[model samples]
Target: SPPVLDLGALGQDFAADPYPTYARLRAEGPAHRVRTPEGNEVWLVVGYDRARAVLADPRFSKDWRNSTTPLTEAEAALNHNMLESDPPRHTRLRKLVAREFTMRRVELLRPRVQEIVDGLVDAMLAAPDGRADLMESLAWPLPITVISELLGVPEPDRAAFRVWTDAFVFPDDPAQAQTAMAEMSGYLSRLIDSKRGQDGEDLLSALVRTSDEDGSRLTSEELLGMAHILLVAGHETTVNLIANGMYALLSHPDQLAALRADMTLLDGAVEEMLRYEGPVESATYRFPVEPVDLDGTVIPAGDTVLVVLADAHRTPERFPDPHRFDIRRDTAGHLAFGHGIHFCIGAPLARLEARIAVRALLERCPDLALDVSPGELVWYPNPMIRGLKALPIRWR
Candidate 1:
């Protein structure tokens, strides 16, 4: 039997900096059977090659129904959407949603994204003190506002959304996650109904109108599922992308200065930020429908496997000096947003938002720096997201 590590006992230490642990795990082997903090056992894939192989392998089913292991209430309830489906269902869902989510479609929103970021920066600058929590002031609100307007959902109370989304992704208990989903489902059902025959330009409106050659449209339940994933996953990924990317820049003075000096480096910096400290710590769970051999290790059929993207992004064999945060690194083929068909659908929107938001903030506050010592910073306890709960910063 492989070594069984208990992440539950390690608690916040594991959450605070899981890289060291991942490094140790990688040293042991490419994969290990470990108990997650939530008390579930999974095969955690750590190295770049193994991570990529697991991701691209078609035998690894995304559907929870393939799991031989029973799921908790949260896990069972959560798999109703596209993220948790396979083949025809996943293909059909992605095609319908992809039309409104293409790069060109998201690009048109750049002006609006820029406008929102500029306004937020203005608000931060106008603060009583020259200091602000970047997470609250900039990172959190920008994506929520953009996605909300894009979806044509009434401007939701951002705080309520934060609660719901956090629970949806980070809940310590099944009940909490279920509660958030129920609340969100109720809101979306009402919101979707309101869009009937309204004829608007928003994504929900477009999705409502979208259909295939066969004239098959999304069912009401499918629409609700799409809306739920879009609102939560769409904004949550970008939220942390901005926060983690900014965290990287602030920590590395040389890179930060380099970015400011050559604004053209913004693109690479964003990619480096993703490669360095990407939003997601691990890809969502995958299960093999049949016994699949990874190296000499056998992950039994229907066993849960998690690909640690953060670890893969920092694999020493793949990236020389992987620990160093250099904006100039090639950073091509990094699996931060993931790979294969399950790759983030919102990549364009996220990249654009970060590109614009980072540039605008730097332009507005030339002297941006961390207000608290790095050690004093507290990371969100959610292992799924590698980001600060609050990033205190100031500018002259």
Candidate 2:
């Protein structure tokens, strides 16, 4: 029997800063069995090389249906998306989606993204007290607006959508999480029904059109799952990217100063931010179909495995001075957007949004600074996502 480290017992301290704990784990070995704060026992893969390998390995299954553990009805419903499927199915689903979600399509949104960022910055600067919560004013709104518009979600429904997503991600109440999922599913189904046969330009409309044109290409449930995953994954990750990226820059004065002095560092800075404190802490749970050897540790069949992206980026063996927040460093191999087949499809959009938002804030609000001490910031307690609950910032 393998040793089980209970992460739930580690408490809030671990949530606040999991790097040290992961580093400690990496020092001991590449893999360990641990109980997540969510109370699911999983094989946690740490370090750069091993984590990268496992991410690309076929033996680690992403499909929940393959797991020995049973999934809830809501969970099972959303499992049809590409992220949760194995090859052949995943390949077919991804191809269909890729045709519509091209880089050209993402690039076209640059002007609109810029406009949204400027509007957000303008609103934040207009605050009477020269202070504002960045998360609420900018971080949360920019991505939400972009993704909502892209998916053709109505303006009136955006607020409720945010509430549901918030509960889904930071589910302090398990029942609330379930409720949120159910509500979101119902909402998406209604939206899909509304989009059917209407030639709309939005992504959802396009997906709906595709399914209607050829039933064999995409099933109705898969359409529902695709819409749900896109809406959730699209905005949630980018919101934290902007929030965490700004938090990183504001906390590191020297790095911030360097970025301000030379705007050209913007691209590298975004990558560094992803490496330093990427929005996602770990990849979704993967199940090994058979006994698998990760480094020296053998993970038995049907056990959950998580590739800790946060840990892999901070491995000293891969990145020198792994703890230092350097905007100039070559962050080429960073798994911030993940690696291999299931890598984030929205990576381009996320990078585009973060770069536009961060640069606009720096350019427009020259005196922008953290109003609250970094130590006082409260991170979301959820292990899957790394984000600040609120980022209080001030500008003169």
Candidate 3:
């Protein structure tokens, strides 16, 4: 059997900074189980190779329909996300969406992304005492701006998007969750309608046309769900990546200096950022299709499993001195973007956004310093993500 922890006993500490807890888990071995808030015993696979193996395992299915566990209200609305579907449907959706995610497409928007970053950074610099909330100005907006533009969401209507998206991604009231979904569906319907009229150079427009040409297109309800996933997933993950990368650089002076001394290490630094402290704390919960054993622990059929990618990345077996953040290190084998076919489709965009943001910040503000100690930094509260809520920075 794998090592298990009384995570509930740890309370919010488990969420605040899971590293210490995860480190403890890794010390034990590859697999474990912890009781959820509802007291359900779910499996957790930690360790580099085991994490990869669990994700790619044929017994581990992505479809919720295959599970015996009843869907919670939160899970119901989020069901349309590609991560929730299994093959045949997963294959079709992925193939249909592949063209939009190519490196060329995201790179084409580099100039625009740079402009956004520069504009925000300048605002941040000019703020009271050169200290501003890096998260609100740059971390959050950069990816949303790109996603809104790519989806061709009208600029005037994009402001309310944060609220609508929040109600689902971080739902506060389950009573209104369905209402939020309805609002999102209505908004998507209007966007899809406009795109149906003309083939604009946007993801939604392209998807609308694709639906027209191919019988494999998503239904109206599914389109709403898919759009929500793309918009929220694209923006939230990158926001965390950019913020976390900056946080890492600010906290680790040696790593920051190493990066500043060599611009060539920027890409590797981004990969290292991912391996050292990735944006996604858990790879959204997955369900087991068949009873399976992972490194001696038997995960029962229909059980929801969480493969802690961040924890696996910190396994001492795979990374020497795993807690240390080294920018020059090789993270090619990291499961930062996950493993196998379910690898994040938006990885290229997230990487580009973070690379440009972190690299440019360091280059422009050579004297950049944090306004608060790393331990005192405020982190975002979420059901699934592990990221900062604010990162106050200044430069002389």
TM-score of every candidate: 0.94, 0.97, 0.90
Tens-place lDDT per residue, model 1, 70-181, is 7655444445678888888889888877876789988888889988998999899999989999999999999999989988867644567888877765676968877877
- Give the per-residue lDDT of model 2 (tens digit) for 78-161: 779999899988998899877545678789889999998888888878899999999999998998899999999998888887
Query: Each candidate: what lDDT?
Result: 0.84, 0.87, 0.76
C-alpha lDDT of candidate 3 relative to the true structure: 0.76
lDDT of 3 at 26: 67
Tens digit of per-residue lDDT, candidate 3, span 271-342: 988887688876767878878876576788887788888877777878888889988776778887887778
**Superposing all C-alpha atoms, what RMSD in Å does each candidate have to the true structure?**
2.1, 1.4, 2.8
Candidate 2: 10-residue stretch with minimal lDDT: 1-10
- What TM-score would you give candidate 2 relative to the actual structure? 0.97
Mark the 10 consecutive residues where model 1 has the least summed lDDT.
210-219
What lDDT is reached at residue 29 by model 1?
82
Residue 345 local lDDT, model 1: 91
Task: Order the candidate numbers by TM-score, best to worst.
Answer: 2, 1, 3
Candidate closest to the true structure, highest TM-score: 2
